[PDB]
Amino acid sequence: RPEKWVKGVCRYCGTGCGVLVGVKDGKAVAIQGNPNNHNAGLLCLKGSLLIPVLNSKERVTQPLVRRHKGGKLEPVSWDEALDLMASRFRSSIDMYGPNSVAWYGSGQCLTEESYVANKIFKGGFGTNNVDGNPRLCMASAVGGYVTSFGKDEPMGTYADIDQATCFFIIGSNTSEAHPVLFRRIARRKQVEPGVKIIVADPRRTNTSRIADMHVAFRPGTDLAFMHSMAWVIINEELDNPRFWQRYVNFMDAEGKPSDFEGYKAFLENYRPEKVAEICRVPVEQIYGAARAFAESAATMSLWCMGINQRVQGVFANNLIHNLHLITGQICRPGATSFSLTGQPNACGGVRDGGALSHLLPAGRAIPNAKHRAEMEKLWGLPEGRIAPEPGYHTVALFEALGRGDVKCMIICETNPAHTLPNLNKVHKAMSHPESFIVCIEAFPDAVTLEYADLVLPPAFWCERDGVYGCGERRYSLTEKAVDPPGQCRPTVNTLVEFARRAGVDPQLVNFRNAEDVWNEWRMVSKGTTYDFWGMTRERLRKESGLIWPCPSEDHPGTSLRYVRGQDPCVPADHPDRFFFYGKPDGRAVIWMRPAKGAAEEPDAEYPLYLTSMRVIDHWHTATMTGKVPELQKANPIAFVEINEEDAARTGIKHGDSVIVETRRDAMELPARVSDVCRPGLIAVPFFDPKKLVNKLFLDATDPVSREPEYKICAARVRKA
Ligand SMILES: Nc1nc2c(c(=O)[nH]1)N[C@H]1C(S)=C(S)[C@@H](COP(=O)(O)OP(=O)(O)OC[C@H]3O[C@@H](n4cnc5c(=O)[nH]c(N)nc54)[C@H](O)[C@@H]3O)O[C@H]1N2
Numbered sequence: 001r002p003e004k005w006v007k008g009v010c011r012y013c014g015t016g017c018g019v020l021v022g023v024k025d026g027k028a029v030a031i032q033g034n035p036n037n038h039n040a041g042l043l044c045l046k047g048s049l050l051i052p053v054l055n056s057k058e059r060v061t062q063p064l065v066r067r068h069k070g071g072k073l074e075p076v077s078w079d080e081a082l083d084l085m086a087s088r089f090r091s092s093i094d095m096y097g098p099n100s101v102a103w104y105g106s107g108q109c110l111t112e113e114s115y116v117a118n119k120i121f122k123g124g125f126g127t128n129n130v131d132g133n134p135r136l137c138m139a140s141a142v143g144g145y146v147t148s149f150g151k152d153e154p155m156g157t158y159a160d161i162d163q164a165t166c167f168f169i170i171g172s173n174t175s176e177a178h179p180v181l182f183r184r185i186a187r188r189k190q191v192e193p194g195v196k197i198i199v200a201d202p203r204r205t206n207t208s209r210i211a212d213m214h215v216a217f218r219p220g221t222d223l224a225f226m227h228s229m230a231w232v233i234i235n236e237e238l239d240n241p242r243f244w245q246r247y248v249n250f251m252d253a254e255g256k257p258s259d260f261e262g263y264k265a266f267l268e269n270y271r272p273e274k275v276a277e278i279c280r281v282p283v284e285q286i287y288g289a290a291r292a293f294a295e296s297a298a299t300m301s302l303w304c305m306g307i308n309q310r311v312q313g314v315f316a317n318n319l320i321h322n323l324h325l326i327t328g329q330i331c332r333p334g335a336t337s338f339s340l341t342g343q344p345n346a347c348g349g350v351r352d353g354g355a356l357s358h359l360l361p362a363g364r365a366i367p368n369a370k371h372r373a374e375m376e377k378l379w380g381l382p383e384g385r386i387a388p389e390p391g392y393h394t395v396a397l398f399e400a401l402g403r404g405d406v407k408c409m410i411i412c413e414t415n416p417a418h419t420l421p422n423l424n425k426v427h428k429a430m431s432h433p434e435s436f437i438v439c440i441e442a443f444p445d446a447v448t449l450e451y452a453d454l455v456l457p458p459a460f461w462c463e464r465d466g467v468y469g470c471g472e473r474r475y476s477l478t479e480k481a482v483d484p485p486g487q488c489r490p491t492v493n494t495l496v497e498f499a500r501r502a503g504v505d506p507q508l509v510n511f512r513n514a515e516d517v518w519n520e521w522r523m524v525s526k527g528t529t530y531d532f533w534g535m536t537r538e539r540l541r542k543e544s545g546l547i548w549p550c551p552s553e554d555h556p557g558t559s560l561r562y563v564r565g566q567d568p569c570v571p572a573d574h575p576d577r578f579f580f581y582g583k584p585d586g587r588a589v590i591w592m593r594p595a596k597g598a599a600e601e602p603d604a605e606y607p608l609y610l611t612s613m614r615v616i617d618h619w620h621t622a623t624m625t626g627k628v629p630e631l632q633k634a635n636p637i638a639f640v641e642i643n644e645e646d647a648a649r650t651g652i653k654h655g656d657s658v659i660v661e662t663r664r665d666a667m668e669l670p671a672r673v674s675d676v677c678r679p680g681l682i683a684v685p686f687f688d689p690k691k692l693v694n695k696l697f698l699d700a701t702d703p704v705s706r707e708p709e710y711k712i713c714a715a716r717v718r719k720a
């Protein structure tokens with residue numbers, strides 16, 4: 001039994017449940033939920049079974065080197081490993097310039113790790129080649145939040161769940177992907193049974209079993225569906241002119257200033273009867289969803305990958321925001337437009353930290369000369385050290401690696417050989433014979449390690465301390481609960497030594513530990529609308545998270561952004577009750593985005609949509625959840641969901657083996673037969689390394705956010 005409990009954060013989803021880690025004699029023995037965090041001491045099965053993951057001996061515990069391409073990976077000392085890393089990166093720069101090198105990181109890295117790596121690269125080497133897996137995930141929501149509101153991140157919090165009276169859940173399997181939050185959604189409807197839930201997703205998932213209405217629309221057509229909802233809202237006079245006349249601007253299909261009549265005129269193109277056939281849904285679903293949405297006392301929307309992983313990803317985020325803005329279902333408890341973040345730290349580490357190729361910390365942008373100067377000053381750099389061109393975004397990064405333009409890359413706390421789209425193309429790029437790939441990776445069964453030239457053994461999870469920022473602007477600390485095993489070291493320390501040895505100015509990496517970097521990050525946020533200077537380590541050790549803006553030590557944090565009296569970034573003396581201060585006139589923007597479809601729609605040759613999805617027992621590539629026997633009990637291996645009425649028509653029975661084929665590859669998979677998938681749709685999970693499904697998927701990206709369309713491509717099925 002535990003002699004002490006160590007406060008931290010669940011290693012997995014963007015719900016960011018707080019955890020207490022029971023330790024006895026330097027060994028973790030137990031785990032419970034933080035009663036004092038938003039989750040109220042509740043964890044899902046994954047969270048509960050983190051202790052066997054932390055205790056696993058199946059770890060990378062010494063540095064490894066692959067002397068030659070194709071060779072065995074063999075033990076090498078830390079000092080040799082760091083010199084090789086430093087010397088290779090420094091030579092690449094020396095010879096070919098800063099853009100020859102890259103960082104490919106993670107929403108699972110601590111905020112401090114991503115902060116150091118971002119600084120080393122952008123301020124140290126002089127390259128903006130810094131990107132990470134939230135590009136694969138949250139970049140569409142950043143675009144939607146920035147274009148609609150002028151600033152990133154939700155404006156409500158999880159607490160709004162407890163007061164909503166309608167939930168519109170689109171592109172989200174909340175029960176399998178954010179279990180604690182789904183339980184909270186179900187709980188609210190349990191307590192207030194008048195509560196209405198619309199679940200919009202081409203698949204019928206466990207999330208829909210609390211839904212008043214499940215809209216099983218055809219993949220790609222939710223933009224039309226959502227415009228059609230605004231038509232209805234407008235048509236039946238369910239909109240909120242006192243709101244939008246004061247607080248909202250309208251932009252036409254060309255992106256030019258327009259107005260409410262322009263909005264109305266545009267929406268004539270999305271009448272319910274016409275859009276109902278596009279979407280393959282009964283028309284009464286458009287009227288029902290719209291009315292529930294608008295008539296409800298308070299409406300909260302929630303979405304994830306089905307919206308974001310799309311070539312029209314940004315546009316889809318805007319269309320959700322349009323509904324909240326036309327109705328004024330925003331800036332009020334219960335009423336908010338809440339994008340769900342998938343990773344434990346995409347928000348804290350990557351989005352807020354500006355650890356993407358076009359960004360700078362705390363709201364700043366690379367193309368922006370003032371922001372560059374603001375950072376050169378804060379970081380003590382010579383003028384112009386920060387390059388004015390964005391670096392390579394993830395897809396183009398790995399394309400650049402394939403061409404030989406990026407010669408040295410660091411991969412940290414991600415598994416891109418398993419999780420990048422269009423894998424045959426990526427595996428080739430990653431096999432460039434003159435590339436130097438360094439992997440910071442905790443588990444030896446990560447398929448990406450088959451591409452690494454050097455592997456560095458990290459402290460995992462609560463083997464070290466640092467901050468995770470979840471989907472609700474909550475910054476929570478994990479304190480160190482146990483020692484790392486073998487030769488495992490905190491990546492914050494590894495990065496500093498790397499930098500130092502590679503000729504970076506030591507004033508740039510002046511950090512003994514992760515606390516040191518936090519204090520600087522605190523400083524770099526100060527005065528911005530991301531200001532969290534009031535989150536001292538002391539505060540974060542005692543509290544179970546603070547929600548930013550939190551500009552000072554006597555400030556409790558912020559639940560309602562953009563709201564006079566609740567958001568410290570809204571001047572107390574501001575004339576209006578709301579203030580969208582990310583736009584220069586204080587107004588949010590309704591965008592009249594034309595509705596299109598997938599980059600690769602089905603046709604005669606490939607008559608099926610193919611989608612890819614989460615499953616509850618498995619975390620992404622299964623290098624962690626795979627260490628837990630109980631998590632292997634329901635879904636041990638990959639499958640392909642097939643619709644019943646589709647199956648029968650083509651002579652496919654259940655458990656039967658099928659070849660899923662697309663323009664790029666062909667994979668045998670046992671068929672799972674249900675009404676889960678709507679007619680003309682199949683779905684594959686991605687946790688199985690023996691079934692690298694991203695070999696089938698296309699690579700196309702939102703032209704703005706550069707997120708890949710993993711959620712749609714054209715496939716075909718054939719009895720093995
Ligand atoms: N158990 C578990 N939980 C997790 C994770 C995990 O690996 N395992 N990972 C986390 C991460 S990083 C993320 S990003 C999230 C992902 O969480 P979600 O995005 O909620 O989960 P997904 O299954 O990826 O996709 C949700 C739905 O998108 C739907 N979809 C497909 N096409 C379309 C479309 O055209 N329109 C719409 N509106 N929907 C569509 C699919 O039917 C699917 O049911 O979950 C997080 N939580």
Ligand SMILES: Nc1nc2c(c(=O)[nH]1)N[C@H]1C(S)=C(S)[C@@H](COP(=O)(O)OP(=O)(O)OC[C@H]3O[C@@H](n4cnc5c(=O)[nH]c(N)nc54)[C@H](O)[C@@H]3O)O[C@H]1N2
Pocket residue numbers: 106108133134136137138305309342343412413414415416418419420440441442443446458459460461612613614619620621622623624686693694697710711
């Ligand atoms: N087809 C398809 N593909 C997808 C998606 C999809 O919906 N469909 N979803 C996309 C999305 S949203 C995301 S978020 C990505 C996620 O894709 P990845 O980030 O590739 O998936 P993970 O399995 O989370 O990889 C994290 C790695 O970190 C390692 N690790 C764990 N702890 C530590 C540590 O302390 N230090 C270090 N250095 N390493 C550690 C783990 O062993 C693991 O190998 O997948 C994307 N890929």
Ligand code: SF4
Pocket residue numbers: 010011012013014015016017039042043044045046047048178179180181
């Ligand atoms: S819902 Fe997410 S944060 Fe909460 S315990 Fe489950 S996996 Fe962890």
Ligand SMILES: O=N[O-]
Pocket residue numbers: 613614615616618619620621685686687
């Ligand atoms: O939960 N991985 O499909």
Ligand SMILES: [C-]#N
Pocket residue numbers: 107133134137138341342343346
């Ligand atoms: C982030 N997922």
Ligand SMILES: [Mo]
Pocket residue numbers: 136137138342343
């Ligand atoms: Mo994600």
